[PDB]
Design a protein around this ligand. Structure first.
Ligand SMILES: Nc1nc2c(ncn2[C@@H]2O[C@H](COP(=O)(O)OP(=O)(O)NP(=O)(O)O)[C@@H](O)[C@H]2O)c(=O)[nH]1
Ligand SMILES: Nc1nc2c(ncn2[C@@H]2O[C@H](COP(=O)(O)OP(=O)(O)NP(=O)(O)O)[C@@H](O)[C@H]2O)c(=O)[nH]1
Ligand SMILES: [Mg+2]
Ligand SMILES: [Mg+2]
Lengths: 417, 423
């Protein structure tokens, strides 16, 4: 009866994902909201950075919109989505709030507002596929994604965003429009207001310089930025002050405003409506169509269904992915070398060779391809490269069988006359 | 006067060069030439307090015989350049001009080198820029302080694996571990009620964070196993937040009077812990202890490798995955063409009229192209366009060879036809 967080996407110990359809259906398919267009707000990013903490202040705003003091009473504990200190991850999978909010757009549109809290990336229990799936899904479902970052916007942040969004793209319909809508770079604990002011305007100037594409820029840097711009219709940045050392280090801290830095609260009171004001709420769109709560449930099911199978390629650790590419490239190089040299010997316009001599040449050329494959430095491991070396040897054996038949025909076809 | 010396330069065109004259001036002096060397380096993400830390290491190295080495509380912090702001400061690799001569417990007189490095992941650097600095600083130092913020996350572990693997590949083959001491320094640790500030809380924390289990997922296991196999001594120190003045006040100067006391307390444990003569390990490479002169030779050799050898250069996660996806698809699509052409014009198959053979090839080539296009790949058709072009070009080359094999089955086809046509 009382409102609370609802586990909607479950991530199990075996790294499998399961959707709680009953709960999702309960919330988004009720008669009161099912036919309404939907605004979905999500927060995502690294674990332990205050994502759920933030969402709970968004809840205070949603519940007390017409009040000037929505931020709460100063002795009131912060509740909603579960948050706490400690070095271990808290939120898992994807949670939504059980109460859908009905908000009047300035035109008169009665839209429904969904709030989505997510499992943090880069925890020690999770595989990269786990983190990417949760990040992609929230981005594919939300119309406003708050990318929660610590201290700065680093190049590895941009490359992770790129990886995660591209993974989302893969499971989506082909489209001629931008795949996603609003992205907010929220920088927590910004330490340089004297370089860029706290808030949206300092954020805007900061992010502008961060994502700017220039002709002098190395292609690797250009491309990640181009990808990001291509993915989102609106991109903004908000620079938030540190909430104070007590918020971060006191195990008894409760979310009470009286224990939070004043300049934080001041910028917080600007941040939330800036994200969530009736003016700012963009209705979810997928490939050119405004999605209702009913439609969102459908896409949520279809998307997770794709991530549950093996139709998509999955993201892998940095060393593992480079390693595969290293080996796949080496296998192709070694095989093409063997092949080119065999054609010089038993191509169609070359004379028939005695079988034993063909075999002797094959064995020499094969061994040279094996040596070539082995001499290329690859990440990561001669033991990672075993499966690929073995594939190379067997694929070359298969090619040689074709070459025997080709060689034999030069003798056979002539005998038949 | 002593000051920081720029030794490794990263050019604005992303190539690498060593300032050999600067290096020789320092490490080839008659005083230190043949001294066994200890090299202390700090590496990690930009703007995290690396240079700042090293300047406190400088104070210790200069005032060991003093009661209070940490300094007067009203004295500014100098040495390696540091500042606030969100833009990176340190570039390439710099070292301190003064080599410190210290006596080890066993009575050796070793030379001590301090090395400050360019922070990783700035927006000016390619991944290869960041990887090369990190790797070299690891390959040169006997003690690598890995400087992190707030936590040891999984992306930090994967970056360390990526960077150390890149270093390892440019090293002489060995059966021993490639490196020596690694310290996970966690800046702004927020949970002393869970793991204490300092080396003991850090030890217990990192023990759980890096523990290998044969039951956890392969990729979690393998990053951990890689890190353990790379270093002979791995440690962890949890440092408190220095206070908001240090992090946020533009007028902050490094004066201890403006730094949180808890940080100072732990800083005064950290530095002697890192730099105590008992624990200062002498640089070894491939089982041999290295002198100062010998360190320079290795620096030049290592640098040369990154300049001119075939190495698997680090790529962004998307880039790497996308290449693998495309390479596999090309291979598969190409193999499908080959197999099906062999059913049509393999050596044990009859001659085909050049026009029949042409239309089979055109049919099968299109089937392979569509096979290639049908497979889901990171990331995009644009990324794949060059690979699709490569596939089509390679299939065209196979077709040319198939034409030659087919002709050899009936060389006289055209000539006999022209003769029978006249008759
Ligand atoms: N330094 C800092 N700490 C913050 C900030 N906001 C909240 N915290 C603290 O961060 C800790 C984690 O809060 P939480 O909201 O649970 O973070 P989370 O991102 O949801 N974690 P998880 O990924 O594990 O779900 C709490 O101790 C909270 O007080 C902030 O802006 N800066
Ligand atoms: N939050 C926090 N800030 C710190 C800490 N130590 C130093 N700082 C602040 O960090 C800022 C950057 O210092 P600096 O030593 O230049 O960092 P760096 O890692 O060398 N930067 P770069 O990689 O760009 O050379 C300074 O404003 C300094 O006051 C710390 O432990 N925590
Ligand atoms: Mg959370
Ligand atoms: Mg620096």
């Amino acid at each position: 009866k009382k409102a609370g967080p609802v586990q909607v996407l479950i991530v199990k110990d075996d790294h499998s994902f399961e959707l709680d359809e009953t709960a999702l259906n309960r919330i988004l398919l009720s008669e009161a909201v099912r036919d309404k267009e939907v605004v979905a707000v999500s927060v995502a990013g690294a674990f332990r950075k205050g994502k759920s903490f933030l969402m709970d202040f968004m809840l205070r705003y949603m519940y007390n919109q017409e009040s000037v003091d929505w931020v709460g009473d100063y002795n009131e504990p912060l509740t909603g989505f579960s948050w706490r200190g400690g070095s271990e991850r808290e939120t898992t999978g994807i949670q939504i709030w059980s109460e859908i909010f009905l908000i009047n757009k300035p035109d008169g549109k009665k839209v429904a507002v969904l709030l989505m809290d997510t499992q943090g990336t880069f925890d020690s229990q999770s595989t990269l596929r786990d983190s990417a799936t949760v990040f992609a899904l929230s981005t594919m479902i939300s119309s406003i994604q708050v990318y929660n970052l610590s201290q700065n916007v680093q190049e590895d942040d941009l490359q992770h965003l790129q990886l995660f969004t591209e993974y989302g793209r893969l499971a989506m319909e082909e489209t001629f429009l931008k795949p996603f809508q609003s992205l907010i770079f929220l920088v927590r604990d910004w330490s340089f207001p004297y370089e860029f002011s706290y808030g949206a305007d300092g954020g805007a100037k900061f992010l502008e310089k961060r994502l700017k594409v220039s002709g002098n820029q190395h292609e690797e840097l250009q491309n990640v930025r181009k990808h990001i711009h291509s993915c989102f219709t609106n991109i903004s940045c908000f620079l938030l002050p540190h909430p104070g050392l007590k918020v971060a280090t006191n195990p008894n801290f409760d979310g009470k405003l009286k224990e939070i830095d004043d300049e934080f609260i001041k910028n917080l009171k600007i941040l939330i409506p800036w994200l969530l004001s009736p003016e700012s709420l963009d209705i979810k769109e997928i490939n050119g169509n405004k999605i209702t709560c009913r439609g969102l449930v459908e896409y949520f099911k279809a998307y997770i269904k794709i991530y549950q199978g093996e139709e998509l390629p999955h993201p892998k650790s940095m060393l593992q992915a480079t390693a595969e590419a290293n080996n796949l490239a080496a296998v192709a190089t070694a095989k093409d070398t063997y092949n080119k040299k065999m054609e010089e010997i038993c191509g169609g316009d070359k004379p028939f060779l005695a079988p034993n001599d063909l075999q002797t040449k094959h064995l020499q050329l094969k061994e040279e391809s094996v040596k070539l494959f082995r001499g290329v430095k690859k990440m990561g491991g001669e033991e990672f490269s075993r499966r690929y070396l073995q594939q190379l040897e067997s694929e070359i054996d298969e090619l040689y069988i074709q070459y025997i038949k080709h060689n034999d025909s030069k003798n056979i076809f002539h005998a038949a006359r």
